């Protein structure tokens, strides 16, 4: 599920699944 | 940034994990 174009909610969903209990930062304008 | 790497181009596990805490 990670090896594709991931935009918007699809990208946040991937970060969520990948990072688990570590959590993540999402910064689309950086 | 992540949009350039994962949205406008193809994402990777490697790159996603760069944004984990």
Task: Look at chain A and report how many structural domains it folds into.
Answer: 1
What is the nearest CA distance from A17 to chain B, expressed in angstroms?
Answer: 10
Q: State whether residue A30 is helix, strand or coil.
A: coil
CB of A1 less than 8 A from some CB of B: no
- Interface A-B, measured as beta-carbon pairs within 8 A, has a size of 63
The radius of gyration computed from the CA coordinates of chain B, to the nearest angstrom, equals: 8
**Whole-Å CA distances, A29 to A25, B1, B9:** 12, 7, 16
CB of B18 less than 8 A from some CB of A: no
Q: Are A1 and A14 in contact (CB under 8 A)?
A: yes
The radius of gyration computed from the CA coordinates of chain A, to the nearest angstrom, equals: 9
For residue A24, what are the β-bridge partners? Answer: B20
Structural determination approach? X-ray
Phi and psi at A12, nearest 5°, equal -60, -40
Resolution in A: 1.5
Query: A19 vs B12: CB contact, 8 Å cut-off?
Result: no
Structural domain boundaries, residue A5: 1-30
């Amino acid at each position: 599920f990670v090896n594709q174009h991931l935009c918007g909610s699809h990208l946040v969903e991937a970060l969520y699944l990948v990072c688990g209990e570590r959590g993540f930062f999402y910064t689309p304008k950086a | 940034g992540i949009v350039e790497q994962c949205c406008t181009s193809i994402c990777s596990l490697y790159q996603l994990e760069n944004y984990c805490n």
